[PDB]
Design a protein around this ligand. Sequence first.
Ligand code: ACO
Ligand code: ACO
Lengths: 369, 369
Amino acid sequence: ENVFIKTTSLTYIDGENGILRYGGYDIEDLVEHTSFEEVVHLMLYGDLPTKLQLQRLKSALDEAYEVPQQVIDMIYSLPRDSDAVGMMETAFSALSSIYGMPWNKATNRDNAVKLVARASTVVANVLRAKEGKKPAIPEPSESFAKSFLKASFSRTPTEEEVKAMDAALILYADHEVPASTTAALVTSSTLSDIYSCVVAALAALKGPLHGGAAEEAFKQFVEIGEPDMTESWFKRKIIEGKSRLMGFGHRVYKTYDPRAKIFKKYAKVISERNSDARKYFEIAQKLEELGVETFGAKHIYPNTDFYSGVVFYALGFPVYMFTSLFALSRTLGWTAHVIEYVEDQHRLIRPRALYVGPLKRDVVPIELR
Amino acid sequence: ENVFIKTTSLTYIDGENGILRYGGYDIEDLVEHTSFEEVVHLMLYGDLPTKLQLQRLKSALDEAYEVPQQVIDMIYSLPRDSDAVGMMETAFSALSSIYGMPWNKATNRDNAVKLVARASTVVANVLRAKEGKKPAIPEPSESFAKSFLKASFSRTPTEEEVKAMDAALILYADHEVPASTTAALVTSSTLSDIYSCVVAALAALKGPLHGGAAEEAFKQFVEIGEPDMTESWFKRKIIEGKSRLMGFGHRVYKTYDPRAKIFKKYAKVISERNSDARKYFEIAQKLEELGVETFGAKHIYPNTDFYSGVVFYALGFPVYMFTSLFALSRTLGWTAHVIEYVEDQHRLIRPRALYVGPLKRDVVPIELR
Ligand SMILES: CC(=O)SCCNC(=O)CCNC(=O)[C@H](O)C(C)(C)COP(=O)(O)OP(=O)(O)OC[C@H]1O[C@@H](n2cnc3c(N)ncnc32)[C@H](O)[C@@H]1OP(=O)(O)O
Ligand SMILES: CC(=O)SCCNC(=O)CCNC(=O)[C@H](O)C(C)(C)COP(=O)(O)OP(=O)(O)OC[C@H]1O[C@@H](n2cnc3c(N)ncnc32)[C@H](O)[C@@H]1OP(=O)(O)O
């Protein structure tokens, strides 16, 4: 009910003007001129890092990728058709049991850095389990994005692929206070460890009113199948059937979502080099044109979910991974919000329930019921 | 901030008068004259069951105890010194991935019944893992309490032991809206499956501002060691050191907590038959006398956590299990609250964060930082 649950210095949103900033820096500026590691430092420490700061952060990520074999075994023992976010939830519960530490001002940010690394290991292994491939642990490389793509796919990505993944990680890092962030905050109020805060976030993200938006948008393209079929699909499903166009519209943004233009940019480059990926990009682009022509006068435009799937697909990720890829990115926003909350504004969360149930009554023996 | 998050028909509390009712039935009446299975039916369906209702409920519990071997393997692959609530969290995430189903009015309560059974299987196996014993799955018996104790300990409990466990399960089933229930509710708002609602609850319960109260109260008795040492401990720690007496005091109850008198009753019976358990019961009883003599005029009295540990210890549970035993019971209240919430009063949870961070600034190249 518009209820402000906390203050933040992390993320500024201007819905009327289409502006998204992390720590005062415009999202476009961050994507073009920084890197996910730099944005991790910005969200956790409040500024972009110096060379030496960046170096220490990178070494901390590198040493954190390795998790115990038992975590990997658990991922690989779930049914291969299980929801990927659910597999992440299970892996993060195990990480919580192994690594969880108490809240401590001096080490909270170091603990979050290690968790973000381990999110990379988990997501790469969730993909590989579902695909029936052998496990792989991310290894040091020139960047977090590159290490994640190499672990995921066992081939060296191109620079354009790396840059697209890096962008996606920045783009999805934080936004508003959705149910997943709220669950993390509630969990943090009892001083549950940071890994368990992420477990709760993932539990909420698994729900189909929160998770699955990138999948639902991209599934439109899959159903269309070929670019020359787009107009007909749009005539039948949208114009005649009055379905909403998935990946259009936003509760805050009354303009294009600033993230959507950036996902689009990166989709174009990497989609062209595979004809399947190219086909989906061409279908999305035609739907975007039809959608803005039809709904732009109502202040309904592409949102961040419209082109993110196109990027992930072009990278080699199946559709079943898209919300998990969101989660990979959003671990930064979850951890940064809970650290802000615990360090500044820790109230123990204790709401009430109004009793509207039966008045006093006496137990009757079962034979008399 | 006294903020009513929902209505409920489950649990009525009168703090001034020391009254606790489930569905209009006084807690004392339920413990004496019903059973945990009957209270499961009351919380989920709104009344105590008929014979035929009870029978169908019991068969549904019996068929639900068995879980896949992979869930058991996961419990047994965590470090044996891991927090027991964390092990539960991991097992419930795996159960969510295997069994999680969408919300459906016709089947929500059946899904909750099966989850409560599986909570029995999980908690029994968490104990057994930590103790380095072979797994055991609960099997049908005369009651849920008995099946749980037999799986836990591989011996047939006495009737008095059964009745104490049954009481404990009823006593802890629901109370107020603590952080664990709040996390469950947030998770349910996205329509995440009931098992993931419990995962979030357990994530919050792991935090030391919510979990661990029965352990902290009972650890006082352990430190005292022998009944003839109680007065000295109380003189030193409480009178001179001004520590609070753990398991005394309550934010709502300004009288004895109605649950505390019932835990006491059941502790007396089963404690006498082992001299270690008897010693702790005698120490607790002497502390209670000292505590009420010292703090009763301030409306500070024993709470539900004071004697629950004594019951659990007398049953054979180590101290490390006490919050997990709470959780076993409270799965009923968690599932019943989320079902009420989703079916009646489902609002998608979307609070806001007020931005107080930096104004607009431009990215500077790393060399200039
Ligand atoms: C987690 C999941 O998987 S679910 C995610 C999948 N969903 C999507 O991809 C669609 C996302 N977008 C939306 O649902 C919405 O646009 C929200 C919910 C973001 C905004 O919806 P509203 O609150 O109705 O927005 P608003 O009040 O601006 O609507 C104005 C008009 O635009 C229409 N509209 C809103 N969104 C859309 C859309 N995506 N497509 C077509 N029309 C739309 C409304 O029906 C309304 O029409 P009217 O003139 O006949 O009244
Ligand atoms: C999850 C965990 O493991 S933490 C759980 C472990 N904690 C416990 O077992 C203790 C539980 N009880 C308490 O902490 C408290 O009694 C609450 C928090 C339940 C109530 O505390 P308050 O809000 O201070 O209650 P209240 O305002 O009634 O206090 C009145 C007086 O009684 C005192 N008091 C309150 N609880 C206790 C206690 N348990 N022992 C001794 N004195 C107490 C207060 O200090 C106050 O003293 P004063 O006259 O010098 O001001």
